[PDB]
Amino acid sequence: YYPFVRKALFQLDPERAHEFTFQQLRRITGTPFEALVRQKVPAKPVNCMGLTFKNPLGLAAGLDKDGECIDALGAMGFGSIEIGTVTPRPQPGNDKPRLFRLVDAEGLINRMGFNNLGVDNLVENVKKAHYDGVLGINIGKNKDTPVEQGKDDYLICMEKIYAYAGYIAINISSPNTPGLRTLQYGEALDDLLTAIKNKQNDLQAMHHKYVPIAVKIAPDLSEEELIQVADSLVRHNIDGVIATNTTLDRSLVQGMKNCDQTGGLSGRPLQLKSTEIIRRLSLELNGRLPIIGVGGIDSVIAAREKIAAGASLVQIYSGFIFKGPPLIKEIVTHI
Amino acid sequence: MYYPFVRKALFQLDPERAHEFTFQQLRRITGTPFEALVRQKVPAKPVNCMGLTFKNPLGLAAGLDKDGECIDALGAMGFGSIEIGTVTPRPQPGNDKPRLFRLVDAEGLINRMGFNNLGVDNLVENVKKAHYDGVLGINIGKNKDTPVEQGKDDYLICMEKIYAYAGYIAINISSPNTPGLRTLQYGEALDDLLTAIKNKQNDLQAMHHKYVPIAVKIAPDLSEEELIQVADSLVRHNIDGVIATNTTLDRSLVQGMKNCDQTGGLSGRPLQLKSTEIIRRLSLELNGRLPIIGVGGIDSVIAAREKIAAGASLVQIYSGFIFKGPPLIKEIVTHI
Numbered sequence: 001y002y003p004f005v006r007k008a009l010f011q012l013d014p015e016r017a018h019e020f021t022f023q024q025l026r027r028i029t030g031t032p033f034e035a036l037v038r039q040k041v042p043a044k045p046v047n048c049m050g051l052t053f054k055n056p057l058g059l060a061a062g063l064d065k066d067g068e069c070i071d072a073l074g075a076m077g078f079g080s081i082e083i084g085t086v087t088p089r090p091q092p093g094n095d096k097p098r099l100f101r102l103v104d105a106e107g108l109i110n111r112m113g114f115n116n117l118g119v120d121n122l123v124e125n126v127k128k129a130h131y132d133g134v135l136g137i138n139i140g141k142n143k144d145t146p147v148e149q150g151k152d153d154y155l156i157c158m159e160k161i162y163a164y165a166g167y168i169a170i171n172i173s174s175p176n177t178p179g180l181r182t183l184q185y186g187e188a189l190d191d192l193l194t195a196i197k198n199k200q201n202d203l204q205a206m207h208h209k210y211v212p213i214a215v216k217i218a219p220d221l222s223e224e225e226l227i228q229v230a231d232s233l234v235r236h237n238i239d240g241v242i243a244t245n246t247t248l249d250r251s252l253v254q255g256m257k258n259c260d261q262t263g264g265l266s267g268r269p270l271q272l273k274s275t276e277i278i279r280r281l282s283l284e285l286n287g288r289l290p291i292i293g294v295g296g297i298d299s300v301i302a303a304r305e306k307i308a309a310g311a312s313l314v315q316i317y318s319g320f321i322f323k324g325p326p327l328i329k330e331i332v333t334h335i
Numbered sequence: 336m337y338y339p340f341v342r343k344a345l346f347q348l349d350p351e352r353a354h355e356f357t358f359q360q361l362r363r364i365t366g367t368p369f370e371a372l373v374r375q376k377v378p379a380k381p382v383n384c385m386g387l388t389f390k391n392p393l394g395l396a397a398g399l400d401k402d403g404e405c406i407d408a409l410g411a412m413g414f415g416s417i418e419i420g421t422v423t424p425r426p427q428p429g430n431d432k433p434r435l436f437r438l439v440d441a442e443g444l445i446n447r448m449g450f451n452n453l454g455v456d457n458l459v460e461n462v463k464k465a466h467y468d469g470v471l472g473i474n475i476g477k478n479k480d481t482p483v484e485q486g487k488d489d490y491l492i493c494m495e496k497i498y499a500y501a502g503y504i505a506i507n508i509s510s511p512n513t514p515g516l517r518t519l520q521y522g523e524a525l526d527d528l529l530t531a532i533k534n535k536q537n538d539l540q541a542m543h544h545k546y547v548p549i550a551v552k553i554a555p556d557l558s559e560e561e562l563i564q565v566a567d568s569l570v571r572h573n574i575d576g577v578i579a580t581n582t583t584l585d586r587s588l589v590q591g592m593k594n595c596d597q598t599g600g601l602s603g604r605p606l607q608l609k610s611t612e613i614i615r616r617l618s619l620e621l622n623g624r625l626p627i628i629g630v631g632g633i634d635s636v637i638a639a640r641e642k643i644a645a646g647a648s649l650v651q652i653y654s655g656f657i658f659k660g661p662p663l664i665k666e667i668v669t670h671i
């Protein structure tokens with residue numbers, strides 16, 4: 001029963017509880033000791049972006065920033081695991097405390113700031129993994145890098161991970177990297193997607209391997225902004241879109257502790273917004289490219305809601321914290 | 336006391352029997368020191384709606400206590416309002432068993448009860464014995480054999496017998512389980528029914544010297560045009576509120592799941608999203624002119640807040656109560 005584990009883990013600070021949880025998972029990942037966390041789940045393959053996904057449920061990015069527990073996490077059922085976000089150089093991200101739990105809303109607020117050990121380190125961890133699901137590597141801009149030259153940060157990363165990644169996630173949706181979201185808009189975006197799509201072709205010829213590229217978008221786009229983003233992805237033949245990241249919105253959590261904290265809200269208070277975004281995106285993309293729906297998913301029905309709204313795959317993070325491994329099994333089994 | 340264990344035990348019984356067994360025990364501990372086995376202390380959150388003052392914004396939706404047999408016990412659990420019914424003028428047995436089905440992985444239900452109830456006179460006798468300090472809703476409908484074009488008579492008969500005792504009156508024209516009933520939601524039929532109902536209200540107010548507000552409970556399967564029509568009629572006829580929404584014929588979210596093809600109304604989590612869309616569109620068309628009670632897949636604080644954001648002034652639960660227990664009454668009332 002996870003509810004008893006969660007009471008205990010919740011007595012610890014959000015980030016401290018994470019550090020502790022992963023300390024443990026790191027001592028067992030890729031060893032027979034992952035029997036402690038293994039959960040059998042039905043096969044439920046899905047073709048998406050030219051890959052076969054073991055099953056439609058994925059671990060959204062942010063949990064295993066550095067790719068330390070891929071094997072252990074896969075043992076829990078995930079048909080895909082998105083590691084990252086990594087950056088070319090390591091950085092510690094924003095200042096603690098930067099992670100807060102809205103328990104009664106089953107949501108999380110975070111201004112982490114791309115806290116990662118960098119891309120070289122991630123690649124070394126990924127070489128130790130033996131995960132038969134699809135591995136996505138999420139990549140981002142270094143804080144100090146000027147947003148005008150952010151492409152350089154993304155292309156460096158692509159070169160080092162291309163040979164080890166199932167799919168690559170372009171993160172331009174973090175509200176905790178100053179100015180980063182602007183990379184979703186206008187000519188900035190068009191500029192970046194051309195860099196990326198060019199490197200991809202290069203790297204395909206270099207490595208003789210086909211790797212899809214997916215852009216992760218924020219949920220706080222306007223209707224016009226979303227129309228422009230959808231048009232852009234289609235025009236640059238981006239293989240997929242991850243919708244969505246965390247939100248600056250707070251309309252559903254007023255009067256709750258840590259409501260006023262700065263950062264991105266996730267979990268149940270993002271569920272509806274995230275579904276709306278996907279539905280409008282689906283209507284715009286009209287089947288021209290797949291959507292990976294993440295945002296507030298915390299039950300079979302909610303997962304299926306994102307499927308009905310247009311998504312070909314779903315990803316979980318906050319609901320994984322609040323409902324634990326059992327959610328993995330519910331969803332894969334019944335989606 | 337811990338609900339998930341209570342739930343596991345009760346789910347060993349078929350849904351109708353689980354309910355009957357539960358209600359038998361509630362009835363048995365009403366008026367005893369074992370009434371505290373269920374009493375819950377919840378924060379007061381007073382809201383004015385339809386000219387009444389609700390303890391809190393959370394009501395028990397109609398269907399759980401069809402005959403008003405457990406008002407006191409259900410009230411002890413913390414509901415701000417209790418909607419009993421649906422009742423019909425004459426008693427009637429409803430549709431044939433099996434008629435009620437759990438979708439446990441969906442945290443949903445399907446039902447085709449067909450207004451199984453002892454009749455409006457039996458209920459007023461129960462209501463007289465009740466001691467509930469919250470707002471008492473009373474939900475009325477058409478007897479099966481009564482013709483659809485004459486259905487209003489059955490509603491009016493009921494209003495006459497319940498006016499003295501109702502806190503508000505709910506008009507059920509949204510059951511998918513009584514043939515043709517949902518057609519009273521359309522055109523000249525809605526218009527005619529609302530006229531007769533509002534004129535009865537006027538005669539009854541004059542005869543009892545008090546105004547009992549009337550809310551119409553609509554279905555979630557209306558289209559956009561039908562919903563605008565429903566809004567417009569409710570306003571022009573000065574109906575005091577709308578309760579949105581009842582069960583849905585939709586099954587798109589429960590495909591591939593045991594019982595998903597059983598005929599009837601789907602409720603619980605697979606209805607939350609649609610019930611919210613309805614409320615939002617209804618709210619735009621009503622533009623604050625009359626209040627909306629929000630029922631439909633509410634199973635958590637955020638789900639409740641989502642309905643409020645969509646335009647509802649109050650909310651009700653049924654399925655979520657079954658699946659999550661009184662902890663949900665407390666959670667919502669506390670953080671809504």
Ligand SMILES: Cc1cc2nc3c(=O)[nH]c(=O)nc-3n(C[C@H](O)[C@H](O)[C@H](O)COP(=O)(O)O)c2cc1C
Pocket residue numbers: 396397398399401420421435444445446448450474507552580581582602603604606630631632633651652653654655
């Ligand atoms: C078994 C059952 C019986 C119901 N009976 C009635 C009823 O008699 N009158 C009514 O207006 N609604 C009735 N309903 C609808 C509920 O009041 C409620 O509107 C609906 O289930 C949606 O809310 P929910 O998702 O919380 O269950 C019934 C629902 C169920 C599941």
Ligand SMILES: CCCCCC/C=C/Cc1[nH]c2ccccc2c(=O)c1C
Pocket residue numbers: 005009010013014015017018021037099101108320321324325
């Ligand atoms: C029992 C198997 C462990 C599965 C991992 C789920 C729990 C992780 C610990 C954890 N991480 C977090 C990560 C990010 C934000 C909040 C938390 C948080 O509040 C807790 C308690």
Ligand SMILES: CCCCCC/C=C/Cc1[nH]c2ccccc2c(=O)c1C
Pocket residue numbers: 341345346349350351353354357373435437444656657660661
């Ligand atoms: C905590 C004490 C009372 C709690 C009330 C919640 C349970 C009510 C009994 C009940 N009704 C139902 C009504 C309709 C459909 C299914 C059920 C069902 O499966 C169960 C178990």
Ligand SMILES: O=C(O)c1cc(=O)[nH]c(=O)[nH]1
Pocket residue numbers: 085110111112113114115171173174175176177245246247264
């Ligand atoms: O670490 C972060 O602030 C962050 C990154 C990202 O892509 N999304 C998010 O909600 N937070």
Ligand SMILES: O=C(O)c1cc(=O)[nH]c(=O)[nH]1
Pocket residue numbers: 398421446447448449450451476507508509510511512513581582600
């Ligand atoms: O008891 C019933 O069949 C019934 C009545 C009603 O008004 N709504 C519903 O979904 N069922």
